[PDB]
Amino acid sequence: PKDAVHLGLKGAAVVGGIGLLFAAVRTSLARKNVGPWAIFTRNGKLAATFAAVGGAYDFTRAAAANLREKEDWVNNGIGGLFAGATMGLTTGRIPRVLGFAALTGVVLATAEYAGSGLRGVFKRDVDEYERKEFLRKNRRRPIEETLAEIGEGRGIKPPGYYERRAQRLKEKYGVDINPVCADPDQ
Amino acid sequence: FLPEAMVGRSKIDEKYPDSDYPTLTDKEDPDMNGGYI
Amino acid sequence: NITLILFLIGILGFVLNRKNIILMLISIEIMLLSITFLILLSSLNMDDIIGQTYAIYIIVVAGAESAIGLGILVAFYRLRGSIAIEY
Amino acid sequence: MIMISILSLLLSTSVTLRRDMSILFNRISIIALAYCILHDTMSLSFISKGIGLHGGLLHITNLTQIFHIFIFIISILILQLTSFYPRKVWIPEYSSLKDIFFNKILYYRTKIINKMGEHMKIIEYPLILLFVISGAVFLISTNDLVSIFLSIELQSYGLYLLSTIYRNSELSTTGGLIYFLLGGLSSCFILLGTSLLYVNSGTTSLDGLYILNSISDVNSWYKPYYLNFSLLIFSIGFLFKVSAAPFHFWSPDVYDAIPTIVTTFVAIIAKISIFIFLLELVYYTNSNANSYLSEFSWTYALLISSLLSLIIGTVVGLTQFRIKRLLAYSTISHVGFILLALSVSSIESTQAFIFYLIQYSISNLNAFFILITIGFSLYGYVTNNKEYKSLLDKNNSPIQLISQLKGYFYINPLLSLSLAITIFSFVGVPPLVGFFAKQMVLSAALDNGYIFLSLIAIITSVIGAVYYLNVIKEIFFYSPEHEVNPVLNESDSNFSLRILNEKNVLIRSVLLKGRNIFISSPFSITISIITNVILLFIFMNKEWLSMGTILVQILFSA
Amino acid sequence: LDKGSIELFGPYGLERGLVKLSKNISSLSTSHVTTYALYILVGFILYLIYNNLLLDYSYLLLIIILLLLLMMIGE
Amino acid sequence: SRHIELKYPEVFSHGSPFNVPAGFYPNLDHVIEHYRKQHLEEEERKAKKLAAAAAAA
Amino acid sequence: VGIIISSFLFKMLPYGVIISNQKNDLFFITSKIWDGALAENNHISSIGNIMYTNYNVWLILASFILLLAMVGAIVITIKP
Amino acid sequence: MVNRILFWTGFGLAVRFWQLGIEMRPFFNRKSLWAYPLFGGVGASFGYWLQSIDEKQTKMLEERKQAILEKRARRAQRQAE
Amino acid sequence: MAGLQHYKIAMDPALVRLGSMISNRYKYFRWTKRTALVSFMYVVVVPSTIGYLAYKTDGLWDLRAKRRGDLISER
């Protein structure tokens, strides 16, 4: 388990701090003699918007892990989905709320599923020659291994298919399979 | 230190006007067909 | 630690400067002196003449670079009449 | 050899003030670089990860010597632009080998060949170019923190001087000022990074830094955070000089402001030297064991810059209308690919990196040569366009607008096709050399698990293709706004050409028109060879790809 | 759909938005050497922060998406 | 490769020859023997290649 | 900028430079040697011992930069 | 069909052709015809030289493959303990 | 008007104007409650319905050589 509120606060701080930095650059780059307190008067919304998004991101992903009791890539998706919605909330247009949510959710989930090399990669630390060798000539597999993942039917009828179907049909419809004979003399 | 004709935002907006992408309201375009009568 | 503060001062020259490109050259010289100051104190702590030799080459290169930059600025002023950005 | 050529050229240049010597001095610089190629060609009959030279301050590797030669060859090709006049007079009665070698042609050439053009009257131009080359070769061969700093200043300072050598242009002097000012900031980051390495490790030797890093990569009193943190500051200064995002802003202004012939050298030479030098530094600091050090690896700055260069380079290029600013943003996009291959350090990515850099340098070279040649081909054309009439420094940069290429396919179709082939190679359309370059980088990135960056690379490529297609649309889909000069061919304006033998005796006379003025052979042949290398790569790829395979196998040789 | 939503949630919407995004990013290129100097400096600090603080990579991607959001909005 | 081969093994001969304190320089005989072996091994490898694969032709 | 840059850059300084900046104060102690002091060089002589022989590649490189600076600053500023 | 000599003889011929096309000069006037045997001859020279690079490159790559297998073998025999 | 000379046609301006509106109508699409509902129905609902039905009946039946005393059902 994890504290969604506590983790969300840290998320708001990290990205609000970055937003505050970008707020300072806008204030520094102002042309008119506005002053040092332009940080929270003109550009203040920028820092607030950044704190709102990264806080929402860290809250909803932390909450998503707590609700599902799982730690997988999906949680980064809903976190981005909520963070993107918060980004679009500032514009005030419903399509931008959804579209911005979708992009943030998709991008952040895709990065987490594939493990983007932004900070390190999943180092195999194994014999790569043996890995590629095994995948290369694994030409024939046990049939059950295939059947475990595509199943029976749809043209996949391994030997003994009919006996199992006979058994399967009896357990469901309560009917014994006795096909008729086309030859009167039998 | 460089001329606006080579770096200014204005000349880009001349090359790519916002008017090149129309934006009508439902009042002037309920039927989304460019105000066709 | 003094060298760190001096490097900040040279860094802050760019942050506090919208229109004065002459101050831009000076900030680069403060940063170069700050880095050379740091090398010199470290080589005194580590008893290494190579650090002093490194400082001497930075001084030479910094002097040669100031020469080129003042030259480029003169070729710029001759056609312009100002070293001021209209910001 | 490069140091002897510089000193000997300087001495001859010192005692001359004659500006008609510029074309001759440029041709000698070509001869000098050909000897440099010969000496480095002889220096490739050993196998080593590296041999330290001159007290350990420099080093040589097979990779170092290959890219020494490559820098020389690109520099000979660029040096043609200042060694031959842009236009020639050709007629079918002075075309035999006996005519070229024993006969001579006499005519008033000054206006036709642009004998007193600006790029033909700068005496010290080939000399400053050689200084930049020396900076670049020395940086490839540097084994030492002080040698790194000296080499990078030497190459950088010559580039600032090259950007300002057209001292009578306000645009050129402005771009030189911008390059020097922001390049001085980036040099401070390089000196800061080198200095923090020294004050922490007590060594200037790159060998010694790699040894300390190798021992520190084990799986408490002096935990070595400094190495990654120093190289991070160190690398940012080098990211500026290759104009990688987000340190890219300077190059679209500088490349557009300086004259186009200068841009060709300035935009190409520096990336080769910095990327090659970065390659070795990336390999020898790669933490094999997943420890705390890998968490703060300085090479993530390369990967972030790669991401940002992919996006900025393609998105910002969409609304560029000045042709040289588009090429600057196109380079930043291609730098994103180069940075991805360098960041993933694998045999496949290093092969991809080596091949990508060389193909990109010859392709960006073909684009600049075609742009210059088109500009020099409008000599016998006129336009009434009002936009073209308000362009600045027209002589320094004859083509400045993409709109200037409108209908150029109707002016010269085969030269327009060469431009289209080069641009389609930048997109990565098979079977051009650019596709195979992009294909190799994507392969390695996917094989090392860089999927997210692989996907951003393909998505950015479609966006980048838009402004590439827009240049091609301009050339092909419209009629031109340029018309042949009426007076250049007016049925009564013939200039005289005398044909004479070895004894200076007149053989025949002939009357000539604007229709007898052509692109000079050095530029047409260079465009033709490179265009056919881009086009026919699929039949020529074995030896070129094998060279990179062998080089990487040496660098990784356990 | 075909002459409607598919065009807007497709090529035509991309053309509208990306041209706007391209023009807003290009507005930062003022050619003011003092402004580029500050840009290099802020980029420097951001790289230092990302590596020094061992930041979550998801934060960096969120930051980039946010920056595109802002450059979507003019002025 | 994880092991780093010195591009410049001669760095083992660096050091000022002046004002040397007695017993200052660490003994390097195992180091020189390491590079003696590296040299003798390489010469043998060439010797057993252009004298053994040359007898065929 | 001051807080961010200073906080990161200070952690990089080795213990030597931060030994005497910001009760139990530490004291540096020194003694003499005799073999080491047989013929001392001043710092300028110690640099001169190695500057032209061991590290003379740096000296050559610096000369080229000085050369380039001389020719470059002259070419861009004066009428030929 | 990738015969190096014929291919690079052809490459030289295509360079001259493209160059004449870029220059907007006629592809075949009689007094210029010596250029095609010349460009093709230079192309043939480049390809005899590429031939010998390929021979060296193949040998180098063959030695490298053996070394990798030899390296793989000894490491495998080391793990036998 | 388009390369080869064609026959004289009484090109009716109203019909030509209608043809121009159809070519340019994509430029004027907007997201409204109506357009979003229609677009969602055609793109999401109906396809997902066929997808769900195809999913649930995949492999359900086989006709080949089925006699009396047998079932069409396989699952």
UniProtKB/TrEMBL annotation, chain B:
Region of interest (Disordered), ranges: 17-37
Protein name: NADH dehydrogenase (Ubiquinone)-like protein
Lineage: Eukaryota, Fungi, Dikarya, Ascomycota, Pezizomycotina
Residues of the full protein shown: 32 to 68 of 821
From TrEMBL, chain C:
Lipoprotein in keyword set: no
Coiled-coil spans in chain: none
InterPro entries associated with the record: NADH_UbQ_OxRdtase_chain4L/K, NUOK/Mnh_C1-like
Entry GO CC: mitochondrial inner membrane; NADH dehydrogenase complex
Statement: the UniProt record of this protein carries the keyword Transmembrane helix: yes
Molecular function per GO: NADH dehydrogenase (ubiquinone) activity; oxidoreductase activity, acting on NAD(P)H
Pfam family, one: Oxidored_q2
Location in the cell: Mitochondrion inner membrane; Mitochondrion membrane
Enzyme class label: translocase
EC number(s) recorded for this UniProt protein: 7.1.1.2
Residue intervals passing through the bilayer: 20-42, 54-79
Catalytic reaction equation(s): a ubiquinone + NADH + 5 H(+)(in) = a ubiquinol + NAD(+) + 4 H(+)(out)
UniProt keywords, alphabetically: Electron transport, Membrane, Mitochondrion, Mitochondrion inner membrane, NAD, Respiratory chain, Translocase, Transmembrane, Transmembrane helix, Transport, Ubiquinone
Membrane-topology descriptor: Multi-pass membrane protein
Any GO BP annotation: ATP synthesis coupled electron transport
Similarity field: Belongs to the complex I subunit 4L family.
PANTHER family in alphabetical order: NADH-UBIQUINONE OXIDOREDUCTASE CHAIN 4L (PTHR11434:SF16), NADH-UBIQUINONE OXIDOREDUCTASE SUBUNIT ND4L (PTHR11434)
Function: Core subunit of the mitochondrial membrane respiratory chain NADH dehydrogenase (Complex I) which catalyzes electron transfer from NADH through the respiratory chain, using ubiquinone as an electron acceptor.
Name this protein carries in UniProt: NADH-ubiquinone oxidoreductase chain 4L
TrEMBL record, chain E:
Subcellular localization, as worded in the UniProt entry: Mitochondrion inner membrane
Residues shown, of full length: 582 to 656 of 665
Record field: transmembrane: 33-50, 57-74
High-level lineage: Eukaryota, Fungi, Dikarya, Ascomycota, Pezizomycotina
Family listed: Belongs to the complex I subunit 5 family.
Role this protein plays: Core subunit of the mitochondrial membrane respiratory chain NADH dehydrogenase (Complex I) which catalyzes electron transfer from NADH through the respiratory chain, using ubiquinone as an electron acceptor. Essential for the catalytic activity and assembly of complex I.
Protein name listed in UniProt: NADH-ubiquinone oxidoreductase chain 5
Species of the source: Chaetomium thermophilum (strain DSM 1495 / CBS 144.50 / IMI 039719) (Thermochaetoides thermophila)
Automatic annotation (TrEMBL), chain I:
Keywords: Membrane, Transmembrane, Transmembrane helix
Membrane-spanning residues: 35-55
Keyword Transmembrane helix: yes
Keyword Membrane found: yes
Protein name, as recorded: NADH-ubiquinone oxidoreductase B15 subunit
Species whose genome carries this gene: Chaetomium thermophilum (strain DSM 1495 / CBS 144.50 / IMI 039719)
